Amino acid sequence: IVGGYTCGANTVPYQVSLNSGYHFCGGSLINSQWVVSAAHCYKSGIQVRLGEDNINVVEGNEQFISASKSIVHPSYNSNTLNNDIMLIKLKSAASLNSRVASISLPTSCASAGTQCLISGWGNTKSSGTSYPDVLKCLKAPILSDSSCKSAYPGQITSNMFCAGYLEGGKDSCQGDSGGPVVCSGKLQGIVSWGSGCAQKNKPGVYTKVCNYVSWIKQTIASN
Ligand SMILES: O[C@@H]1[C@@H](O)[C@@H](O)OC[C@H]1O
Numbered sequence: 001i002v003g004g005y006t007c008g009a010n011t012v013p014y015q016v017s018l019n020s021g022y023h024f025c026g027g028s029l030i031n032s033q034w035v036v037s038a039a040h041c042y043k044s045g046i047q048v049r050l051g052e053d054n055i056n057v058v059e060g061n062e063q064f065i066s067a068s069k070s071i072v073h074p075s076y077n078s079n080t081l082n083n084d085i086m087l088i089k090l091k092s093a094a095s096l097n098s099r100v101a102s103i104s105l106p107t108s109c110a111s112a113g114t115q116c117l118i119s120g121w122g123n124t125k126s127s128g129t130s131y132p133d134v135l136k137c138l139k140a141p142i143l144s145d146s147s148c149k150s151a152y153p154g155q156i157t158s159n160m161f162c163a164g165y166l167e168g169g170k171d172s173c174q175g176d177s178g179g180p181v182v183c184s185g186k187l188q189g190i191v192s193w194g195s196g197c198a199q200k201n202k203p204g205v206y207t208k209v210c211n212y213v214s215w216i217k218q219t220i221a222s223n
Pocket residue numbers: 079080154155
């Protein structure tokens with residue numbers, strides 16, 4: 001997160017860190033046994049880390065649970081990042097409490113102009129590199145489809161939306177991938193891609209979760 005603020009320990013209780021020896025992506029807890037993330041975050045050997053603030057210090061609210069199964073969206077295209085979503089099932093159910101909690105799936109899509117909360121442990125510099133240890137937050141609006149398409153000609157699908165600031169300086173970034181965009185208490189986006197970070201006229205591009213609720217639900221019901 002570039003241009004954001006320190007969330008505060010466990011104030012984003014659905015935020016998960018995906019760990020393969022080190023933090024490499026975010027995700028979102030959607031019930032006691034399932035995490036949603038970006039398909040481009042797929043790898044083997046994932047441990048899901050819940051209840052994290054400082055990802056380099058054991059502070060007392062963590063739950064570390066290995067993945068038992070990963071399901072990349074059937075139509076994920078890694079070249080275009082269309083359908084950049086995946087589901088991860090935990091080997092055991094997380095213990096849900098105030099600091100570790102699921103986030104509701106949307107019942108409708110969010111409109112341009114809605115303010116959302118984006119969070120992650122990604123890079124905090126736009127020309128440079130500094131990875132934070134504690135969770136960073138950014139409040140950002142969804143941008144219009146037309147400004148999104150004009151920013152990224154030929155690249156925005158119906159499964160993507162832009163959010164952030166065309167002036168630059170505030171964005172998600174490398175290492176935030178897979179994490180949440182939450183708008184009015186609903187998971188509307190997954191951190192997916194962008195040109196650099198926090199660059200002028202290059203806002204963040206997000207997986208449009210509302211398109212995937214039926215696939216998420218039926219997948220969960222049968223796995
Ligand atoms: O976003 C672009 C994608 O849609 C494709 O065209 O490959 C190149 C990327 O930069």
